[model samples]
Target: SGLKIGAWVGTQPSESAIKSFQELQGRKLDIVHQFINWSTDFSWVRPYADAVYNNGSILMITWEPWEYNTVDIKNGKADAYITRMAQDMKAYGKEIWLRPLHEANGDWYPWAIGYSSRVNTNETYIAAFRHIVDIFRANGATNVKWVFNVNCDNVGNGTSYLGHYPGDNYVDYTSIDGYNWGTTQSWGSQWQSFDQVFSRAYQALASINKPIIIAEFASAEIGGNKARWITEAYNSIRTSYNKVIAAVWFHENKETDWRINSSPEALAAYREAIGALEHHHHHH
Candidate 1:
């Protein structure tokens, strides 16, 4: 009831991935977070949502203006696109955890503040975020949960640089995407431990009193220590910090280097951690 853990499967969902999810013991599939790039269409989204619901999992969808913004940015058509999407979602009776412009503070994507390379300030970013929410609400969409996500970075300056947030009234949850990138800055490095990441972000969001989700995370190139990292990360979140509700592992087959499901041993460890969490309860 607190937080839900799952992976971000790409858009145009796959039946094989869905089947693998059905067989997993403690793992839950996150049907949202799929990317609809230039070539993809939105027609399949409803059916995919239906499949995820039938499989007993919740859907968390990500929207990016650079990708799904089908309207010309100059004509205010972006707002129209979002409104239509929201209306369509409502008509299909789907409740989506909508996350748009995720990791906007990071430089990896063009949607990010520093990466967009546009002559714009943080104010523009906030306006776009607020506008999308307004349009969605106006289109009779009440089943959407908005997630304002940021990438874990130099913590102190991260939020301020990210832009003017819409505050708690516009958001339902807050999430951060982090991973163990094997840096040399001790176990507390940005990508080394969950504590380092949550300690900073949790404190920043404490005033809001909302549950946290590690929207995306994973450990890689640790040789045989993948299982250990999974156990330690889970322990750090569930025991050290009580705010984390769910942490999704980044699973990809092409890049077996960091894939949690790459090896049987690693998969076993992941399953163990999942089982422990599912059966876990707070004893007061």
Candidate 2:
């Protein structure tokens, strides 16, 4: 597989957002990513899936198990919700990439592994993940491509993200979610290149022996040359991280100027870089 370009446009599932982003980039994205909470109604799934399909983009859902903990999920307390989601997708009859409880290595999410006091143990994390996959399979939702997404850096002290892997049987794809803060916030002291942000995590994910994706990533324009970063990011992915078959830019202006059009120069650089990617056919 070649590098597939994708983006998570804010106000997800809006046809206008997709159209506007496609127009901005001068091409349609290969995949469109959306984040959904477990607490939300499943009513939106059908409409969102239809919208993405109609726009010629595959949808990848970041299913956050916010209100529910891994213990409950693993213990079958959330089986009804899980089964209903699976049945809905199965009935929709379209292939959808699903990342449930993503960034589990990061402490911000309720499912983070190292905090023994807050949630279940690492064993339960794996059990929860496998249980969800099993439920999807049993519900005949084979179209669900399970993406095991982890934070680029494991925030948990004395714990490795590898400890939480659900094994290869339950995961179809692995992903690293990273970002370059670029001195935009208190936590960020310097501008980080693409390699700086993702190198270690990419290597760690590569060892898992599954195809990888930069599931969510973006560079801030505060401390470095954003245009050059955009250009070199794709080049580095193409040359060095061939195991990474897809990348999804976090295209929102929420935290910083993560928008590719933060500057005209940045947008031009991205347009050119993606154009090169588009020209090189997959399987070439």
Candidate 3:
């Protein structure tokens, strides 16, 4: 009935994974997560969607346009892709969280404003975002729930979160992604607390005033008590982070084994903390 603990099991969670996570004291995952590159054709999304449904979890799809500096997005060229995907979503006849151009506040993504001359301004980004949604609806796809996501520490990246917003009318839910690198991360040298990782970012996103979802997040177990971190992380979302209705774990080992099963201690602590939640009254 509270926050749903969603997870990203390496883009493709095997059937065994689907079965195993649901066995967490019977507190199954609330959402099945995946990331698809913009170049991917919409025709094949059904198989992934089917897998999530077969596992009794809802699908939360992050559509990334990480290729080519987003020229197609700012122009009308991306319409064919959006129309096709939107039409496909309509055929599915189910509610889907379609997150597009995620991490748009950071320079790492081509879709982010100021990344290049093509997608250089908020005006272009906003137009591109609305254009996608308009095309989707035009193709008669109303089952899609548009989620606009960004990265934490946008200020460090020389961008503000609100600056990339696609507008409240086009965005149904807002999300942000962060990882606890803990100095062990190949990409970072500092350790951070759960609050330090999200409090400011999450609060700043409140201006959007929409359903909040933690797009992707996980902690590295290297420099600290990961088990304790897991406990406090979930506790914060369930108790203190009231605006967050959905939280997803980036359950992969690539970036310092952020997976829940990274360690026995971490897994046990995760099971205890998440499994204690009440009955399911959650979105997928």
Candidate 1 lDDT over residue span 61-129, tens digit each = 766666532123323656556666877877776677888777766665555655635423366666667
Q: What ranges in model 3 sit over 4 Å off?
A: 23-26, 114-118, 155-158, 186-188, 281-284
Which residue pairs in candidate 3 have backbone atoms (N, alpha carbon, C) closer than 3 angstroms, thus clashing? none
RMSD of each: 4.9, 2.4, 2.4
In terms of lDDT, the best-performing candidate is 2
Distance (Å) between predicted and true CA of 264, model 1?
2.8
Distance from true position, residue 188, model 2, in Å? 4.1
What's the candidate order when arranged by decreasing TM-score?
A: 2, 3, 1
By the lDDT metric, which is better: model 1 or model 3?
A: 3
What ranking emerges by lDDT with the best candidate at the front? 2, 3, 1
Residue pairs in clash, model 1: 3-245, 32-60
Query: Ten-residue segment with the worst summed lDDT in candidate 1?
Result: 67-76
Name the candidate, 1 or 3, with the larger TM-score value: 3
How well does model 3 score by local distance difference test? 0.78
lDDT of each: 0.63, 0.85, 0.78
Task: TM-score each candidate.
Answer: 0.82, 0.95, 0.92
